[PDB]
């Protein structure tokens, strides 16, 4: 079960990577779905979504395509396009996905991978505007955008206290490893570091 | 044999030979591979990984080479006969002249530092690549 810090990423680039490795048969959480960032100015990104809102079934709206405004189900929809989701293999694969706005209390402990070719540095040029998913959703009416920021602050304080302890462990580990290098030998230290 | 093949003297017209070439009878009178070699870079007393059948992940030393592509293994945990299909040649080569003798292999490997511990150890695959593993 992978977890993906999806801050910094592009929506379609991540979704193309994620949707492929779902079909290979692997469970995959992503987290921080709101800090995924699309190409375009804020004007341009909103006008794309306002076209998507028009698309309703005329006889009745209830059977119409649903317009999910939360970032965690905007991203889930972009992945659903790239999987054959109507088949049994696609519906099994799509069930293995997970998106969360703000990394929740379950997945704080897990080691978080960052798939490098979907980062907005590598794929967009410099001097071209980009917007977040959270910024867009709030504009499109998501009402919990404000709440998520509050939660991040509480978490990132507690994540800082982990690292100040983890420094103190690894510093005295290096001072312990300073002693053990003399016990093995001069030439044994070369074989570990350099490889002879 | 392909001797007794002769050209027909007929010029029947049912069948016509366009150039000088004439129709051929192809008849006789009524009266009547591979070497499978031994593999180079498996000498007498090379250290070898066994990857097939009964023994897997167990190293062995080739006491002697039978020939015809089959070699007889020896070592601590010994004396079995298996082909080059089931073997991977390591670079390291313990000096043993003698045929079979399981006692001499541990005695000879006691010369080279921690080679006796090396031979009895299992070989196993882990997380993080055999193609790239240079042996």
């Amino acid at each position: 079960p992978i977890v993906i810090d999806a801050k910094g990423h592009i929506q379609g680039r991540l979704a193309a990577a994620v949707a492929k490795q779902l079909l290979k048969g692997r469970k995959v959480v992503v987290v921080r779905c709101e800090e995924i960032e699309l190409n375009g100015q804020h004007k341009f990104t909103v006008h794309t979504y306002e076209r998507f809102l028009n698309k309703t079934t005329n006889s009745n709206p209830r059977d119409g395509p649903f317009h999910q405004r939360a970032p965690h189900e905007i991203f889930a929809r972009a992945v659903r396009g790239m999987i054959p989701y109507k088949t049994h293999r696609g519906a099994d694969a799509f069930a293995n996905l997970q998106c969360y706005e703000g990394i929740p209390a379950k997945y704080v402990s897990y080691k978080r991978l960052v798939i490098p070719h979907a980062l907005r540095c590598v794929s967009i040029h410099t001097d071209r505007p980009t917007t977040k998913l959270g910024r867009l959703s709030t504009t499109m009416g998501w009402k919990y955008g404000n709440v998520v920021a509050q939660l991040e602050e509480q978490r990132k304080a507690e994540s800082a206290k982990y690292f100040e302890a983890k420094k103190a462990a690894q510093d005295k580990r290096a001072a312990a490893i300073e002693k053990v290098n003399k016990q093995l030998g001069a030439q044994a230290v070369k074989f570990l570091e350099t490889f002879q | 044999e392909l001797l007794f093949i002769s050209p027909i003297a007929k010029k029947d017209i049912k069948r016509p030979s366009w150039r000088g070439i004439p129709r051929i009878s192809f008849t006789r009178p009524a009266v009547a591979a591979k070497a499978v070699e031994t593999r180079a870079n498996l000498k007498v007393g090379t250290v070898v990984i066994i990857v097939g059948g009964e023994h897997q992940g167990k190293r062995a030393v080739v006491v002697a080479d039978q020939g015809a592509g089959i070699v007889k293994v020896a070592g601590p945990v010994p004396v079995n006969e298996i082909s080059q299909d089931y073997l991977i040649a390591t670079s390291t080569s313990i000096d043993v002249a003698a045929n079979a003798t399981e006692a001499q292999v541990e005695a000879a490997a006691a010369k080279v530092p921690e080679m006796v511990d090396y031979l009895k150890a299992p070989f196993t695959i882990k997380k993080g690549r055999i193609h790239l593993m240079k042996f």
Partner: protein, 179 residues
């Protein structure tokens, strides 16, 4: 040495032109003009990826001008003319498409024309001696597989970044990988 003599003098040694060619049919049968498949039936190149040796004179070159989109062809060297006939060579004897096997096949057909064994037959191709068309007719059409690079563009000529038509010397580069 005849080339290096003329450069030291001043002149140019222009070489002798190609006496024969080797004509792969690149494109298949259908959607094709009747004059332009009468011409392919005359070279015995009916199936796709078939080839024979063709002698070059103003009869045969002007025929090849009509059929240039359908074929790739060029001027093979002696090592290529060899290696076709030893590997893939077959004798069309009494309309049977027989494999070449042994030299007693081609002594019986061609011995009266002073071509005894497969070395003498291959020679009669690449020197284009007096009994060429006997030796060429004796050979059945070659049958080659599609080559292990592929090739870029069926429907353009080699000269304009494609495949078909005359490629002079570089047919040897193609036939190596067709074989």
């Amino acid at each position: 040495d005849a080339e290096n003599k003329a450069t030291a003098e001043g002149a140019f040694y222009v070489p002798a032109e190609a006496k024969f060619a080797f004509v792969i049919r690149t494109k298949g049968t259908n959607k094709l003009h009747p004059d332009v498949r009468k011409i392919l039936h005359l070279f015995r190149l009916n199936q796709k990826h078939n080839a024979i040796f063709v002698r070059l004179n103003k009869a045969t070159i002007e025929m090849l001008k009509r059929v240039t989109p359908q074929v790739a062809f060029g001027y093979p060297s002696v090592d290529m003319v060899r290696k076709l006939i030893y590997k893939l060579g077959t004798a069309n004897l009494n309309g049977q498409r027989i494999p070449i096997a042994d030299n007693q096949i081609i002594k019986v057909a061609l011995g009266h024309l002073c071509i005894e064994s497969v070395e003498d037959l291959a020679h009669e191709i690449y020197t284009v001696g007096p009994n060429f068309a006997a030796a060429n007719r004796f050979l059945a059409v070659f049958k080659l597989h599609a080559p292990k690079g592929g090739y870029k563009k069926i429907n353009r000529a080699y000269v304009e970044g494609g495949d078909y038509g005359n490629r002079e010397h570089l047919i040897d580069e193609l036939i190596e990988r067709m074989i």
